[PDB]
Tab-separated table of N, CA and C and ligand atoms in Angstrom:
chain	number	residue	atom	x	y	z
A	1	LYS	N	96.529	95.741	96.821
A	1	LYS	CA	95.999	95.137	95.428
A	1	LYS	C	97.130	95.256	94.436
A	2	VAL	N	97.438	94.237	93.740
A	2	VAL	CA	98.386	94.339	92.582
A	2	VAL	C	97.524	94.248	91.409
A	3	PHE	N	97.236	95.363	90.538
A	3	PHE	CA	96.654	95.183	89.357
A	3	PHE	C	97.422	94.545	88.131
A	4	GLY	N	96.810	94.024	87.204
A	4	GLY	CA	97.371	93.771	85.998
A	4	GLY	C	97.301	95.113	84.878
A	5	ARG	N	98.066	94.998	83.877
A	5	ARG	CA	98.054	96.429	83.114
A	5	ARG	C	96.663	96.684	82.478
A	6	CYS	N	96.022	95.823	81.985
A	6	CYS	CA	94.829	96.317	81.584
A	6	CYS	C	93.562	96.412	82.616
A	7	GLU	N	93.579	95.913	83.683
A	7	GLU	CA	92.759	96.034	84.732
A	7	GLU	C	93.042	97.552	85.240
A	8	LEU	N	94.198	97.977	85.413
A	8	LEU	CA	94.718	99.260	85.768
A	8	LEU	C	94.274	100.461	84.944
A	9	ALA	N	94.521	100.010	83.419
A	9	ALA	CA	94.075	100.963	82.493
A	9	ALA	C	92.743	101.215	82.632
A	10	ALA	N	91.788	100.063	82.641
A	10	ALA	CA	90.318	100.402	82.777
A	10	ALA	C	89.913	101.208	83.830
A	11	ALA	N	90.528	100.952	85.151
A	11	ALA	CA	90.312	101.762	86.173
A	11	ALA	C	90.614	103.147	86.029
A	12	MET	N	91.877	103.367	85.473
A	12	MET	CA	92.260	104.721	85.240
A	12	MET	C	91.297	105.375	84.435
A	13	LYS	N	90.918	104.841	83.319
A	13	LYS	CA	89.956	105.472	82.337
A	13	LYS	C	88.605	105.588	83.114
A	14	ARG	N	87.996	104.852	83.950
A	14	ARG	CA	86.774	105.068	84.556
A	14	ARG	C	86.966	106.338	85.481
A	15	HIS	N	88.102	106.479	86.130
A	15	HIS	CA	88.375	107.576	86.978
A	15	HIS	C	88.855	108.767	86.482
A	16	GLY	N	89.017	108.837	85.118
A	16	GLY	CA	89.203	110.283	84.310
A	16	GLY	C	90.576	110.393	83.880
A	17	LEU	N	91.455	109.536	83.830
A	17	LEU	CA	92.881	109.981	83.455
A	17	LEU	C	93.254	109.853	81.971
A	18	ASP	N	92.264	109.263	81.178
A	18	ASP	CA	92.493	108.953	79.724
A	18	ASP	C	92.442	110.233	79.112
A	19	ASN	N	93.808	110.769	78.594
A	19	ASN	CA	94.075	111.932	78.055
A	19	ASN	C	94.103	113.284	79.043
A	20	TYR	N	94.067	112.803	80.282
A	20	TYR	CA	93.856	113.815	81.362
A	20	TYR	C	95.152	114.732	81.216
A	21	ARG	N	94.970	116.127	80.998
A	21	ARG	CA	96.094	117.024	80.628
A	21	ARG	C	96.884	116.702	79.471
A	22	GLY	N	96.082	115.983	78.522
A	22	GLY	CA	96.883	115.567	77.328
A	22	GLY	C	97.690	114.206	77.587
A	23	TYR	N	97.762	113.557	78.636
A	23	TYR	CA	98.516	112.374	78.903
A	23	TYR	C	97.672	111.295	78.570
A	24	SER	N	98.028	110.272	77.466
A	24	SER	CA	97.298	109.240	77.054
A	24	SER	C	97.307	108.089	78.311
A	25	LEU	N	96.429	107.221	78.168
A	25	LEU	CA	96.310	106.137	79.179
A	25	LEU	C	97.735	105.461	79.314
A	26	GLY	N	98.317	105.137	78.234
A	26	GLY	CA	99.542	104.233	78.435
A	26	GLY	C	100.717	105.010	79.128
A	27	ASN	N	100.546	106.654	79.298
A	27	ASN	CA	101.630	107.159	79.973
A	27	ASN	C	101.273	106.963	81.556
A	28	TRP	N	100.015	106.757	81.776
A	28	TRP	CA	99.729	106.646	83.215
A	28	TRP	C	99.899	105.325	83.659
A	29	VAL	N	99.694	104.401	82.819
A	29	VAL	CA	99.899	102.843	83.066
A	29	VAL	C	101.495	102.758	83.091
A	30	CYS	N	102.380	103.181	82.392
A	30	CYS	CA	103.562	103.013	82.394
A	30	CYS	C	104.174	103.656	83.602
A	31	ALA	N	103.658	104.867	84.085
A	31	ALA	CA	104.066	105.430	85.359
A	31	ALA	C	103.963	104.488	86.513
A	32	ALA	N	102.819	104.062	86.522
A	32	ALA	CA	102.211	103.153	87.626
A	32	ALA	C	103.090	101.984	87.705
A	33	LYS	N	103.363	101.276	86.588
A	33	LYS	CA	104.439	100.227	86.486
A	33	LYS	C	105.604	100.446	87.143
A	34	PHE	N	106.422	101.533	86.712
A	34	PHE	CA	107.655	101.907	87.278
A	34	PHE	C	107.584	102.583	88.562
A	35	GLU	N	106.488	103.274	88.946
A	35	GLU	CA	106.554	103.708	90.273
A	35	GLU	C	106.302	102.700	91.451
A	36	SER	N	105.433	101.828	91.081
A	36	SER	CA	104.667	100.896	92.200
A	36	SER	C	104.657	99.461	91.725
A	37	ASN	N	105.126	99.191	90.563
A	37	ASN	CA	104.789	97.866	89.867
A	37	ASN	C	103.400	97.429	90.051
A	38	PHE	N	102.550	98.386	90.001
A	38	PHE	CA	101.079	98.377	89.937
A	38	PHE	C	100.446	97.759	91.344
A	39	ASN	N	101.255	97.928	92.399
A	39	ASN	CA	100.735	97.638	93.713
A	39	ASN	C	100.304	98.883	94.461
A	40	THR	N	99.169	98.928	94.976
A	40	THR	CA	98.393	100.074	95.644
A	40	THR	C	99.087	100.186	96.990
A	41	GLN	N	99.740	99.149	97.638
A	41	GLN	CA	100.257	99.427	98.935
A	41	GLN	C	101.592	99.842	99.010
A	42	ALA	N	102.412	99.849	97.763
A	42	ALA	CA	103.726	100.407	97.804
A	42	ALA	C	103.982	101.772	98.491
A	43	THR	N	105.084	101.769	99.405
A	43	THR	CA	105.706	102.710	99.939
A	43	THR	C	107.165	102.822	99.763
A	44	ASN	N	107.695	104.004	99.735
A	44	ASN	CA	109.220	104.208	99.619
A	44	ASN	C	109.567	105.382	100.325
A	45	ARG	N	110.417	105.405	101.146
A	45	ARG	CA	111.019	106.483	101.903
A	45	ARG	C	112.163	107.123	101.083
A	46	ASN	N	112.153	108.438	101.073
A	46	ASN	CA	113.207	109.198	100.436
A	46	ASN	C	114.154	109.558	101.478
A	47	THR	N	115.424	109.673	101.183
A	47	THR	CA	116.528	110.129	102.128
A	47	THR	C	116.274	111.479	102.855
A	48	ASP	N	115.406	112.245	102.331
A	48	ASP	CA	115.102	113.370	103.089
A	48	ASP	C	114.048	113.403	104.234
A	49	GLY	N	113.543	112.222	104.291
A	49	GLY	CA	112.447	111.902	105.212
A	49	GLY	C	111.066	111.923	104.479
A	50	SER	N	110.719	112.535	103.566
A	50	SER	CA	109.341	112.339	103.068
A	50	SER	C	109.257	110.613	102.702
A	51	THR	N	108.110	110.348	102.419
A	51	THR	CA	107.671	109.282	101.788
A	51	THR	C	106.614	109.172	100.695
A	52	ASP	N	106.964	108.270	99.642
A	52	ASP	CA	105.981	108.175	98.344
A	52	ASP	C	105.080	107.025	98.669
A	53	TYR	N	103.759	107.185	98.505
A	53	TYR	CA	102.760	106.481	98.557
A	53	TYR	C	101.841	106.018	97.409
A	54	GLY	N	101.666	104.652	97.512
A	54	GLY	CA	100.711	104.233	96.554
A	54	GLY	C	101.224	103.755	95.090
A	55	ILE	N	100.000	103.694	94.367
A	55	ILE	CA	100.276	103.142	92.997
A	55	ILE	C	100.819	104.419	92.058
A	56	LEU	N	100.883	105.498	92.464
A	56	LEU	CA	101.713	106.452	91.713
A	56	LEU	C	102.761	107.010	92.552
A	57	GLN	N	102.847	106.739	93.773
A	57	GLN	CA	104.056	107.032	94.522
A	57	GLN	C	103.988	108.585	94.800
A	58	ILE	N	102.830	109.032	95.258
A	58	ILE	CA	102.639	110.431	95.767
A	58	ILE	C	103.527	110.623	96.842
A	59	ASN	N	104.149	111.977	96.943
A	59	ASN	CA	105.197	112.118	97.913
A	59	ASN	C	104.501	113.125	99.056
A	60	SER	N	104.921	112.828	100.173
A	60	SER	CA	104.353	113.715	101.398
A	60	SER	C	104.995	114.921	101.526
A	61	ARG	N	106.156	115.021	100.719
A	61	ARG	CA	106.733	116.487	100.766
A	61	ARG	C	105.700	117.644	100.348
A	62	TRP	N	104.788	117.378	99.472
A	62	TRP	CA	104.013	118.263	99.164
A	62	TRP	C	102.421	118.070	99.134
A	63	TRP	N	102.148	116.726	98.950
A	63	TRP	CA	100.730	116.274	98.622
A	63	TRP	C	99.907	115.768	99.510
A	64	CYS	N	100.319	115.147	100.408
A	64	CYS	CA	99.604	114.408	101.555
A	64	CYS	C	100.199	114.603	102.899
A	65	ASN	N	99.384	114.406	103.947
A	65	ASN	CA	99.936	114.380	105.254
A	65	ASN	C	100.088	113.038	105.788
A	66	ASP	N	101.341	112.843	106.411
A	66	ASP	CA	101.687	111.692	107.117
A	66	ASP	C	102.225	111.931	108.637
A	67	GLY	N	102.191	113.169	108.885
A	67	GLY	CA	102.653	113.586	110.181
A	67	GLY	C	104.003	113.290	110.360
A	68	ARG	N	104.944	113.030	109.529
A	68	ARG	CA	106.403	112.760	109.787
A	68	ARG	C	107.353	113.271	108.820
A	69	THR	N	106.700	114.365	108.130
A	69	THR	CA	107.456	115.189	106.969
A	69	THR	C	107.666	116.504	107.401
A	70	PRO	N	108.561	116.895	108.375
A	70	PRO	CA	108.517	118.315	108.653
A	70	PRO	C	108.553	119.147	107.424
A	71	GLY	N	107.949	120.304	107.625
A	71	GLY	CA	108.002	121.442	106.772
A	71	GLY	C	107.297	121.132	105.466
A	72	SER	N	106.607	119.970	105.437
A	72	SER	CA	105.862	119.726	104.016
A	72	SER	C	104.409	120.296	103.980
A	73	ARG	N	104.027	120.152	102.904
A	73	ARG	CA	102.636	120.560	102.485
A	73	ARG	C	101.599	119.305	102.459
A	74	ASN	N	100.310	119.642	102.248
A	74	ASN	CA	99.409	118.593	102.080
A	74	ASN	C	98.258	119.231	100.898
A	75	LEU	N	98.791	119.209	99.867
A	75	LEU	CA	97.986	119.937	98.797
A	75	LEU	C	96.941	119.132	98.394
A	76	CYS	N	96.857	117.929	98.282
A	76	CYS	CA	95.694	117.003	98.065
A	76	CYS	C	94.559	117.080	99.241
A	77	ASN	N	95.171	117.533	100.506
A	77	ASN	CA	94.187	117.533	101.531
A	77	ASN	C	93.721	116.258	102.035
A	78	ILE	N	94.681	115.314	102.185
A	78	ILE	CA	94.386	113.826	102.430
A	78	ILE	C	95.509	113.291	103.375
A	79	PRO	N	95.019	112.345	103.957
A	79	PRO	CA	96.070	111.445	104.700
A	79	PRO	C	96.829	110.674	103.643
A	80	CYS	N	98.113	110.373	103.823
A	80	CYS	CA	98.894	109.710	102.924
A	80	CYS	C	98.394	108.209	103.035
A	81	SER	N	97.808	107.588	104.092
A	81	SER	CA	97.238	106.335	103.995
A	81	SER	C	96.212	106.283	102.799
A	82	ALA	N	95.309	107.157	102.752
A	82	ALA	CA	94.391	106.985	101.673
A	82	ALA	C	94.783	106.777	100.382
A	83	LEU	N	96.083	107.053	100.110
A	83	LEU	CA	96.741	106.812	98.848
A	83	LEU	C	97.032	105.295	98.736
A	84	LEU	N	96.808	104.456	99.749
A	84	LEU	CA	97.206	103.192	99.743
A	84	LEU	C	96.010	102.226	99.571
A	85	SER	N	94.806	102.686	99.297
A	85	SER	CA	93.743	102.100	99.102
A	85	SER	C	93.446	101.106	97.971
A	86	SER	N	92.843	99.991	97.939
A	86	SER	CA	92.543	99.011	96.743
A	86	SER	C	91.878	99.864	95.637
A	87	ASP	N	91.017	100.733	96.147
A	87	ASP	CA	90.409	101.643	95.111
A	87	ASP	C	91.180	102.829	94.830
A	88	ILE	N	91.376	103.133	93.622
A	88	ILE	CA	92.501	104.166	93.256
A	88	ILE	C	91.825	105.663	93.178
A	89	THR	N	90.661	105.746	93.436
A	89	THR	CA	90.100	107.111	93.503
A	89	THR	C	90.957	108.412	93.959
A	90	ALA	N	91.408	108.036	95.459
A	90	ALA	CA	92.069	109.034	96.007
A	90	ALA	C	93.347	109.560	95.259
A	91	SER	N	94.110	108.288	94.802
A	91	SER	CA	95.388	108.624	94.037
A	91	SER	C	95.113	109.202	92.740
A	92	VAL	N	94.030	108.933	92.087
A	92	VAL	CA	93.758	109.472	90.775
A	92	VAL	C	93.541	110.981	90.920
A	93	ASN	N	92.740	111.145	91.983
A	93	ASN	CA	92.206	112.482	92.159
A	93	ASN	C	93.526	113.618	92.531
A	94	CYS	N	94.267	112.961	93.283
A	94	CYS	CA	95.555	113.704	93.749
A	94	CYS	C	96.569	113.872	92.502
A	95	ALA	N	96.767	112.834	91.824
A	95	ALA	CA	97.541	112.902	90.520
A	95	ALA	C	96.978	113.928	89.542
A	96	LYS	N	95.746	114.243	89.412
A	96	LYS	CA	95.271	115.103	88.499
A	96	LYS	C	95.753	116.518	88.929
A	97	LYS	N	95.823	116.806	90.209
A	97	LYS	CA	96.325	118.032	90.857
A	97	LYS	C	97.873	118.259	90.562
A	98	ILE	N	98.560	117.131	90.638
A	98	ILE	CA	99.970	117.101	90.463
A	98	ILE	C	100.252	117.439	89.001
A	99	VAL	N	99.763	116.578	87.990
A	99	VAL	CA	100.112	116.889	86.781
A	99	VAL	C	99.409	118.006	86.163
A	100	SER	N	98.635	118.977	86.887
A	100	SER	CA	98.245	120.236	86.410
A	100	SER	C	99.006	121.312	87.001
A	101	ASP	N	100.074	121.137	87.650
A	101	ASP	CA	100.820	122.171	88.535
A	101	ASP	C	101.897	122.777	87.564
A	102	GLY	N	102.058	122.418	86.320
A	102	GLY	CA	103.124	123.411	85.487
A	102	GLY	C	104.084	122.282	84.824
A	103	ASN	N	104.486	121.206	85.564
A	103	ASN	CA	105.550	120.392	84.797
A	103	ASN	C	105.029	119.067	84.468
A	104	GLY	N	103.724	118.964	84.091
A	104	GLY	CA	102.982	117.746	83.489
A	104	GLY	C	103.497	116.643	84.265
A	105	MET	N	103.856	115.487	83.380
A	105	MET	CA	104.124	114.263	84.190
A	105	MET	C	105.460	114.257	84.374
A	106	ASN	N	106.350	115.124	84.277
A	106	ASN	CA	107.762	115.268	84.747
A	106	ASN	C	107.891	115.272	86.248
A	107	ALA	N	106.824	115.543	87.025
A	107	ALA	CA	106.708	115.269	88.461
A	107	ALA	C	107.014	113.816	88.813
A	108	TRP	N	106.736	112.955	87.989
A	108	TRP	CA	107.138	111.504	88.277
A	108	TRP	C	108.496	111.214	87.621
A	109	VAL	N	109.389	111.063	88.499
A	109	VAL	CA	110.808	111.156	87.864
A	109	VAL	C	110.869	109.771	87.023
A	110	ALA	N	110.245	108.716	87.680
A	110	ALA	CA	110.307	107.406	86.857
A	110	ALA	C	109.615	107.511	85.385
A	111	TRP	N	108.527	108.392	85.357
A	111	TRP	CA	107.905	108.611	84.130
A	111	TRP	C	108.920	109.078	83.139
A	112	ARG	N	109.579	110.308	83.722
A	112	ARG	CA	110.623	111.122	82.718
A	112	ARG	C	111.677	110.165	82.496
A	113	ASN	N	112.180	109.283	83.177
A	113	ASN	CA	113.387	108.465	82.897
A	113	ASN	C	112.855	107.331	82.294
A	114	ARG	N	111.746	106.626	82.351
A	114	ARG	CA	111.534	105.301	81.666
A	114	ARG	C	110.331	105.270	80.754
A	115	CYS	N	109.484	106.368	80.787
A	115	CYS	CA	108.187	106.443	79.853
A	115	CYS	C	108.380	107.306	78.901
A	116	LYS	N	108.842	108.564	79.215
A	116	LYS	CA	108.563	109.790	78.330
A	116	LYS	C	109.402	109.315	77.073
A	117	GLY	N	108.654	109.700	75.947
A	117	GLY	CA	109.281	109.594	74.710
A	117	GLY	C	109.269	108.148	74.109
A	118	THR	N	108.864	107.033	75.094
A	118	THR	CA	108.673	105.717	74.611
A	118	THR	C	107.350	105.328	74.092
A	119	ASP	N	107.316	104.115	73.387
A	119	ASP	CA	105.997	103.576	72.870
A	119	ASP	C	105.062	103.168	73.950
A	120	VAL	N	104.475	104.245	74.795
A	120	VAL	CA	103.693	103.967	75.993
A	120	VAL	C	102.367	103.241	75.604
A	121	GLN	N	102.008	103.390	74.227
A	121	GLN	CA	100.820	102.515	73.936
A	121	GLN	C	100.937	101.235	74.140
A	122	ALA	N	102.095	100.592	74.020
A	122	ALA	CA	102.180	99.182	74.312
A	122	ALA	C	101.774	98.619	75.717
A	123	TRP	N	101.660	99.648	76.545
A	123	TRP	CA	100.965	99.381	77.890
A	123	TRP	C	99.648	99.062	77.999
A	124	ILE	N	98.908	99.546	76.989
A	124	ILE	CA	97.471	99.506	76.977
A	124	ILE	C	96.998	98.377	75.605
A	125	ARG	N	98.116	98.077	74.854
A	125	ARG	CA	97.912	97.301	73.649
A	125	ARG	C	96.938	96.000	74.147
A	126	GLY	N	95.902	95.770	73.316
A	126	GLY	CA	94.957	94.547	73.457
A	126	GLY	C	94.160	94.633	74.714
A	127	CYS	N	94.095	95.675	75.262
A	127	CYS	CA	93.270	95.838	76.614
A	127	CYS	C	91.756	96.202	75.877
A	128	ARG	N	90.827	95.617	76.729
A	128	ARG	CA	89.420	95.760	76.597
A	128	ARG	C	89.145	97.036	77.458
A	129	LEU	N	88.915	98.113	76.791
A	129	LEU	CA	88.754	99.316	77.707
A	129	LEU	C	87.352	99.981	77.273
B	1	CHT	C1	105.957	123.198	94.365
B	1	CHT	N1	105.472	122.225	93.730
B	1	CHT	C2	105.151	122.689	92.324
B	1	CHT	C3	106.522	121.166	93.612
B	1	CHT	C4	104.311	121.673	94.217
B	1	CHT	C5	103.486	122.988	94.919
B	1	CHT	O1	102.683	123.454	93.922
B	2	CHT	C1	105.644	94.787	79.101
B	2	CHT	N1	104.540	95.034	77.980
B	2	CHT	C2	105.051	94.216	76.804
B	2	CHT	C3	103.398	94.531	78.537
B	2	CHT	C4	104.564	96.451	77.829
B	2	CHT	C5	105.874	97.115	77.640
B	2	CHT	O1	106.266	97.790	76.527
B	3	CL	CL1	98.895	94.917	97.482
B	4	CL	CL1	95.283	93.048	83.232
B	5	CL	CL1	99.856	111.403	75.422
B	6	CL	CL1	98.928	105.314	75.005
B	7	CL	CL1	99.430	106.733	94.567
B	8	CL	CL1	104.060	116.155	108.336
B	9	CL	CL1	99.264	122.224	103.190
B	10	CL	CL1	95.771	113.674	107.721
B	11	CL	CL1	89.604	101.351	91.350
B	12	CL	CL1	102.334	118.839	79.666
B	13	CL	CL1	106.358	116.766	93.438
B	14	CL	CL1	95.406	97.850	71.151
B	15	CL	CL1	91.931	93.066	78.612
B	16	NA	NA1	102.758	94.223	82.530
B	17	NA	NA1	109.126	107.712	92.836
B	18	NA	NA1	102.891	116.254	103.873
B	19	NA	NA1	103.526	115.236	113.667
């Protein structure tokens, strides 16, 4: 599924991301834009053999099991395929664990490089939430 920005903002709010760990909805929407272009089916393989999955590009190195990332963890206790669903629940629940682990949203490199410090409210401007 490819979301529009306001559709995704509304779904993220329903699933509890609005100001989760102090990060406003615009931060989460901005991260999703630059991680996945709002596409729940996005996958990207890293040079080291891990893979990033879904709307928030969650990495098999730590967070989900894909059976092909040697030495990795599965800290969200989920198959990585579950992070590719049209329903964003599994990705949101796993993202809550990631953002709570000490470094906030800096875990998402694209957020740090493209969203952090910017006018992220523009991502939710005009949206009926
Ligand atoms: C080690 N990380 C913090 C990157 C994830 C495991 O807690
Ligand atoms: C691209 N938008 C204008 C929708 C938000 C970016 O700031
Ligand atoms: Cl899709
Ligand atoms: Cl929209
Ligand atoms: Cl914020
Ligand atoms: Cl915002
Ligand atoms: Cl994801
Ligand atoms: Cl593995
Ligand atoms: Cl594990
Ligand atoms: Cl599994
Ligand atoms: Cl959803
Ligand atoms: Cl923080
Ligand atoms: Cl990470
Ligand atoms: Cl607004
Ligand atoms: Cl809207
Ligand atoms: Na957009
Ligand atoms: Na990424
Ligand atoms: Na893993
Ligand atoms: Na295996």
